[PDB]
Symmetry: C2
Subunit: 238 residues, 2 copies
């Protein structure tokens, strides 16, 4: 039917606009933070082992304010030179086995992690990870934590004409932004079953009611943006 | 005339697109460069008179890659540490008399100078200036040179109908972008006389020929984007 295709078209417009909005907030913010993280890393490579220097650099106020927290974890122990005022590394914390560290050591390069559960804030964030070198010798890696607070802002600003909403997931189906924030950190299947994580239009039945779902991908992060509408309500509206 | 008014509407559309482009590409880039310059300054005031430290920092690859050049000028003896492989400051150079220095010194925070056109070429250059302090004492300032290469790309990528083009000036009317870069560094009145630097719409007759001009400002730089068309040719394309 034509009404049904119109709904699909409007969902598509809201989806494309959200894709573009993610790119223009998160990605440009990430691009800027990457150069800062890279330079900071090259500066610490002027005297890598010296914890007192790294500490002074990480507590310089512009840096301290551009990231949730920054830290350097050393190859030769589980100690972290950190700038996080509201956190300290508990008895067990081994930097060498956290994603930012492993990814950085693996790639020998600046990396960006998948969204992940932070030890400190317990919310989901992403990290820039950098290898810290000294004469070809790997001595540690750095994290530069980035809050995903803009995602929650994007998602809570759009209501698909009182029929539905948008949400965001990782490539593995983990929800990182949802109007109901209690859904974050859970697989999106928990609230939207029988939907494939793939781009293109799907119609599902859930408790005798019918929903239309569309996904678009944000390729540089490989996040998925989902748009879901209650088809009955939306049919009545349009 | 609904045709000419449609002309005006189409020129406005392009103008807005160009205002959006300058913010999205040049402002975004400067925002990120100011963050880098602010952090670099704070790091150097861990030990500012250590010229060996300063040099190591300014020569680190990302910093050296992200800017045309960076320099630290000292208040007490007017000496300079810089990373420009093609320039060495002699005693005929006093950084303390330079605009970025004075402005940084006076404002006591990061400043951005007016852009200029290097006379030995047509490169557009702007400088970020930062004050350097030690124990609450002003000990010098830094400059961070940014080349504005995006400007040429932006105006060279747009063609108004084929009836005209867009160009960019400073608040003082100096041309810093134009499809013919020969005009860069010159007052725009050189190729477009009897036009006011003012937001809005103007029509003038030059060489028995009629032109439509619209200007939008880019507020955080106070630059003006100009859009000019041969209005007869535009009239014919709409009709
Ligand atoms: Ca701490
Ligand atoms: Ca030099």
């Amino acid at each position: 039917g034509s009404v049904r295709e119109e709904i699909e078209s409007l969902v598509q417009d809201s989806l494309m606009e959200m894709v573009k909005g993610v790119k223009n907030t998160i990605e440009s913010d990430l691009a800027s933070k990457k150069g800062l993280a890279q330079s900071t890393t090259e500066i610490l490579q002027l005297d890598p082992t010296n914890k007192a220097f790294a500490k002074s650099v990480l507590e310089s106020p512009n840096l301290k304010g551009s990231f949730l927290a920054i830290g350097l974890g050393y190859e030769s122990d589980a100690t972290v030179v950190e700038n996080d005022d509201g956190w300290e590394p508990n008895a067990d914390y081994d930097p060498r086995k956290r994603p930012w560290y492993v990814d950085a050591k693996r790639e020998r390069k600046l990396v960006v992690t998948e969204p992940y559960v932070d030890i400190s804030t317990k919310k989901i964030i992403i990290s820039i990870g950098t290898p810290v070198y000294q004469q070809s010798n790997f001595v540690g890696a750095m994290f530069y934590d980035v809050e995903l607070t803009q995602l929650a802002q994007l998602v809570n600003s759009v209501n698909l004409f009182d029929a539905g909403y948008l949400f965001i997931t990782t490539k593995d189906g983990v929800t990182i932004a949802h109007p109901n924030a209690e859904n974050n950190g859970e697989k999106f299947s928990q609230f939207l079953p029988n939907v494939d994580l793939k781009e293109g239009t799907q119609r599902i039945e859930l408790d005798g009611k019918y929903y239309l779902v569309k996904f678009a991908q944000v390729p540089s992060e490989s996040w998925y943006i989902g748009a879901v509408v209650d088809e009955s309500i939306a049919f009545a509206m349009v």
